[PDB]
Symmetry: C5
Subunit: 283 residues, 5 copies
C-alpha cells in the first residue's frame, strides 16, 4: 500500500516548536560531547586511542548532521495559516540521519571492540565484519525509507526493514561473541563495565527501529514529531551515555596497565574522584 513520508505532514506551531527544540538540543549536546572528547583525550593510553578516534568521529559527523537538519528545518517548512507546510527541503530534516548513522554505527562498533581483549589480525576480522554489518544495516534501511518507494511504500519499507534487521542480528552476534570472549580475559572491574556497555549499546540500537515502524504504521504531524523526539533523544543517550562508558573502561584499562608495568602514563588517572594510577616518566 501507499503511505505518507514523515516529511510530508503539516506541523502545528507546537509540533514545529518541539521539533526545533529537540533538533537544536541534540545538536548542542553533540557539540558538547565533541569538546569533552578532545578535552579528555589524554586520559587514555595509546593502547586505547582508537576509542578516542571513534568517539571523535561519531561526535563530529553527528554534529554536522544535526546542524544541517536544523537549517533544513528552518527552510523546509513555511507558516501557511496556523500550520507549517513541508517544502522539498523537509526530507532534509530526516534523511541526513542515515548518513550520520552510516558512519556512527560502524564507529560505535569499533569503539566497543577497542576496549575488548582482541589483538592482531583477530582485531581485524571482527572489526571488518562488524563495520560491514553495521553499514549494510543502515544502508538497507535508507533504501526502504528514503530511496526505493520514496518512503511512501509499505512493501518497500517492510522488505528493506527486514533486510536491515538481518544485518542487525549479524552485527549484534559478532559484537556479542567478541565481548563474551573478552570478558574472561579482562579484570573483574573492567569486565563488569564492558558487559554493561554492551547491553547499553545493543539496547540503544533497539530504539532506532521503532522510529522506522512508526513511518510504516502512522502518519501525521504528531507522528513526525514523535519520530524526531525519539531519534533525538536516542542520539543524546547513546552518543553521550555510551561514549562516556567506553572512556571509563579505557581509563580503567590504562590505569591497570600502568600498575602492571605494561606502560606508563603522563598524568594520574581519576575515575569518580578516586585515583586509579599515578603519573610516571619513561625510566
Amino acid at each position: 500500500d501507499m503511505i505518507s513520508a514523515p516529511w510530508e505532514a503539516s506541523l502545528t506551531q507546537a509540533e514545529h516548536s518541539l521539533i526545533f527544540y529537540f533538533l537544536a538540543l541534540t545538536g548542542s549536546a553533540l557539540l558538547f560531547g565533541l569538546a569533552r572528547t578532545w578535552l579528555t583525550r589524554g586520559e587514555v593510553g595509546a593502547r586505547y586511542r582508537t576509542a578516542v578516534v571513534a568517539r571523535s568521529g561519531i561526535m563530529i559527523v553527528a554534529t554536522l548532521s544535526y546542524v544541517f537538519m536544523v537549517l533544513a528545518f528552518t527552510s523546509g517548512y513555511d507558516h501557511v495559516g496556523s500550520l507549517w507546510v513541508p517544502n522539498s527541503e523537509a526530507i532534509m530534516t530526516i534523511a541526513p540521519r542515515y548518513v550520520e548513522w552510516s558512519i556512527a554505527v560502524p564507529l560505535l562498533s569499533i569503539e566497543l571492540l577497542s576496549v575488548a581483549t582482541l589483538s592482531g589480525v583477530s582485531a581485524r576480522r571482527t572489526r571488518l565484519a562488524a563495520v560491514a554489518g553495521a553499514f549494510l544495516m543502515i544502508f538497507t534501511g535508507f533504501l526502504g525509507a528514503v530511496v526505493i518507494g520514496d518512503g511512501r511504500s509499505v512493501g518497500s519499507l517492510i522488505i528493506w526493514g527486514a533486510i536491515s534487521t538481518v544485518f542487525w542480528i549479524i552485527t549484534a552476534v559478532i559484537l556479542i561473541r567478541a565481548i563474551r570472549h573478552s570478558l574472561p580475559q579482562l579484570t573483574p572491574e573492567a569486565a563488569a563495565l564492558l558487559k554493561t556497555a554492551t547491553i547499553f549499546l545493543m539496547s540503544g540500537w533497539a530504539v532506532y527501529p521503532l522510529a522506522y515502524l512508526i513511518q510504516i504504521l502512522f502518519a501525521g504531524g504528531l507522528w513526525t514529531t514523535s519520530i524526531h523526539i525519539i531519534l533525538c533523544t536516542a542520539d543524546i543517550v547513546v552518543k553521550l551515555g555510551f561514549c562516556g562508558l567506553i572512556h571509563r573502561i579505557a581509563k580503567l584499562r590504562t590505569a591497570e596497565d600502568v600498575r602492571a608495568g605494561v606502560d606508563i602514563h603522563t598524568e594520574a588517572i581519576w575515575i569518580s574522584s578516586v585515583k586509579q594510577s599515578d603519573a610516571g616518566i619513561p625510566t
Copy 2:
C-alpha cells in the same frame, strides 16, 4: 487570558539598536569565555577536569545560541517606517535561549559539584538528580513560554511556570545539600570560595524567572528590550563570573593536592599573582 508574545511587538530604532548591541555583546563575551577556558585548561588537575569540560560545554552552546539569535535578529525584523516589525524569525531571537539553558543549567550544576567533596557513586546519584531537575525546569518553562499556548496564554505561562519553579526548588535543594556536606570536608580557603560560588549561582538563577514574569505581565517593545537586556546581562555575569569562580576553586584544590602529595602538577599554580604550588615531575 490571551497576551502578546515578546517576539510579537514592534521595536523602535532605539530598541532595535539596544537589542542588537546586547545580543552581540553577550555572544562576544561568551566567545572570549570559550577561549579563556581552553587557554587555562591546564591550570587544573585531572581530578578536577570535569569543571573544564562543563565550562567548555556551557561556553560553546551559549556562543552558538547567541550567534543564531543575532542572525535571526537581523532577519527577524523589517524596518517598516520608523519602527521594526517582527517577522516569523522573531521568535528565533528568544526561543534558542531555552535550548542553551537546557544544556547549560545542568552543566552548571555539574561544574559546581565538580569541586565539591563527593566521590564514587555518591557523585552519581546527586549528579543525575541535579541534571534531571535542571533540565526539567528549563523544559517545563519552554513549554509554557513557547509551545503550549504559543507564549500568548497567561494560564499556560502561569501553570508551566509553577511547574518549572518546583523543579527549581528541587535542583537547588539537591545542590545546596551537597555543598553543605562538602564544606566541612574542604579546607577553609576552598570552603569559603565554594560557599560564595553556590550563592552566586543560585542568585543568578533567580534573575531568569524575572524575564518570565515580564512576559506574563507586560507586553511592548520596551518590555521585549528589557527581557533581552536582563537575560543577556545575566548570561554574561553568570557564565563569566561563576565560571571564573569554579576555576579558582579547582586551581586551589589542585594546589592543595600537590602540596599534600595526592598528585603532582606540571606547572606552578598562581592565584591572584600568588604562587600556590610549584611545578613537579612524575616520580
Copy 3:
C-alpha cells in the same frame, strides 16, 4: 541641531573601494594577531597567562566584528549610478565597532595590569574599576552615536560624548595610578617597557574620540571614508602594536622569575634574538 549619520552618505567608487580595502585589511591583520597569540602563548609563564587570555579575547572579538562589518558592507551599499547608495544595513558597517570596543577596551586594561605589580584583592579592586570605567565609556558613546538620536542629533552626540569622556578620564587615572605604583617595584628594563606601553595605549585611545568628533562636525562620503580609515588604522596599530608590547614584558618578567628561582619555564626565552632565560625541568 540635526546631522546625517556616517552610514547615511553615498560613496563614490573610490570611497567604496578604500573602505572595503581597510575593512578587509584590518580584519586580516587581526586574524594574523589571533594566530600569533596562540602560537606564542607558551613563551610566557603562568603568572602572566592573563595577558594571553586578554589578548586572545581582543583578537577574537575584533576579528568577528570586522568580518561582520565586511559582509555588511558588501550588502549595505548598492551601486545606483556611479555612486553607492547606503541601504538600511549600512549602519551594520559602523555599529559593530562599539560591540567590539565594549569587550576590547576593558580587556586591554586587564592586559596592561596583568604585567604590573598588583596582587591579591588589590589587583581585583583596580581591575573591576577599570573594567567598569572602560565599558561605561564605550557604552555611553554608543548611546550618543547610535541609539539616542539615531546618530543624527548633535546635542545627543555632544552630551553622551562628554559623559563618555568623563569615564575615559576615570579609567585612565585608575590605570596610570596603578602603573605608577608598579614602576618602582619592577626591574628597570621591565619598568621602561611598561611606561612605554602605558603611553602607547593611552595615546591610541585618543584617536578613537576623533572619529566621534567627525561624526558631529562633518558629513559626507569623504568623511565616512575618513572615519573608516582612522578607526581601521587605529585598530591595527593598537591591537597589533600594544599587544606585542605586553607580550614582551610578560616574556621579560617570566625570564626574570626563572633567573630568580621564583619559577621554572619549559623553554628558553628569546627577546630580540637575545636569550633571556634557559629551559628548565620541574625540580
Copy 4:
C-alpha cells in the same frame, strides 16, 4: 561526436537521493579521517612527519571539495515534476573533484615516498617528478572532461584522456621504481606493508579512469549516479584505507628506530594492540 556532460542529465528522486547520500557520506568519512589524522599525529616520529602532513592535506582538501559539492548539489537541481533538472550549478557537483585530485594525488605520492628509504636530494628528484606527473595527469584530465569541449566532446575526452594516461604511467613507474629500491633496505615487516600499500594505491588509482570512460560512453541519470557512487566509494577506500596503511608503516618505522637507538619517542607505539616500542626520555 557531441555527447551529454554527466551534469546535464535529469535525475529521478531515487538517483537524486542516492547521490546526496554518497556525497554526504564521503564528506563525513573524510572529516572523520581528518580528525583521526590529528588525533594520531604523535604516534609517528619526526623522521616520518611528512606522512602526517600529506595525509592532513589530503583530508582537508577532500573534505572541502565534498562540502562544496554537497551544497552545489542542493542548489544545482530543481524538482521540476518527478525528475530533478540540472541547473548551471550542476557542474559544480562534479568539477570540484578535479581540484581536489590535483592536490591529493601529488600528496598521496608524497605520503608513499615518505615511508620509503630515499633520503637527501634523492628524495627530491623523485618527489618532484612524481608531484609533476601526478598533477599533470589530473590537469590534462580536467581539460578533456570539463574545459576543452565542455565535457561534451568525445574526441576531446579521448585525446586528453590518453594524455592523462601517459602521465599516469610515468608517475606510476617513478613511484614503483622508488619503492622497489626501498623494499630491500627496509625490514621485512615494513617492506611487506609497503609493497601492499603500493599495490593498494596503484589499484585505487585505476578506478578513477573508469568514471572517465563512462562519461565518454554512456549518458543518463543512471550513469551520472554511477559516476558519483564509483568516485565517492573510491575516495573513501583510498583516502581512509591507504592513509591508514601509511600510518602503520610510519609507526612501525618509528618503533624500529626507537629500538635501534636511532631516535627516542615520547609514547609507546602499539600496532594491533601489540607494543612495538616503549616510551623514552631525551637523554
Copy 5:
C-alpha cells in the same frame, strides 16, 4: 587613455572553468600550507618562532582571500548565452588579492629576516623599514589598479605602478643588504640556503608586476584568465615553495644551536631524512 578593467570582460565557458579551477586550486593549496605550518611548528626553536608566526599569518590571510574570491566568482558572473558576463561582484574576484598582499609581502619580509643574523634594535630598524616599504608598494599598486581611475585609466596605472616600483626597489635593497650582512655570519650550509631563499623571494616578487602590465596593455577574457593563472600560480610557488625554504633554514639553525649548546630542543631534527640534532631535556 581609457581601458577595460580585467573584471569587465566576458568569459567563455573554458575561461570561466579555468579560472574557477585555479582559484580553487590555489585556495586549497594554501589551506594545505596552513596545516603544514601548524603541524611542523615544533621543529623549530623559540629563537626562530617568528618564522612560524609569519608563515602562519601568510597562509591564513591568503586562504581567506581565495575563499572570498572563489565565492565572489560563483556570484560575479552570469551565464548569458554561451558567455559569462561580469556583474559588480566581478571586481571581488581580483581586488581581495591586494588585501592579501598588503599583509603577506610585509610578513614574507619578516619571515626572511627571521632566519638572518640581525638581533636587538638592529632587527627592528630593518624590520620596520621593510614592512613599510612592502606595504606601501602594494598600497600604491592598489590605488592605481582599483581606486584612482577605477582600473580603467592607463595614466593612473602607469603613475601608481611607477610609485609602487620605487618602493619595490627600496624594500628589495633593504632586504638584500640585510641578507648580505648575515651570510658571512651564518654557517656555510645555512648561508647557502639563505642566499637561495633570497633569490627565490625576489624572483617571485617579479612575477606579480607582470599581471599589472597586462592590465595596462591587454584587455579581454583571455587576458583576465591569464592574469588569474599567473597570480594563482605565483602564489602557490611562492607561498608554498619559499615558506618551505625558510622552515628548513630555521630547522637547520635550531639544530646548529642544539649542537653548540646555545639551546636544547625537545625533538630530534631531521632534514631530508638526515638527523641534524638529537632530542634533549632542559636540565
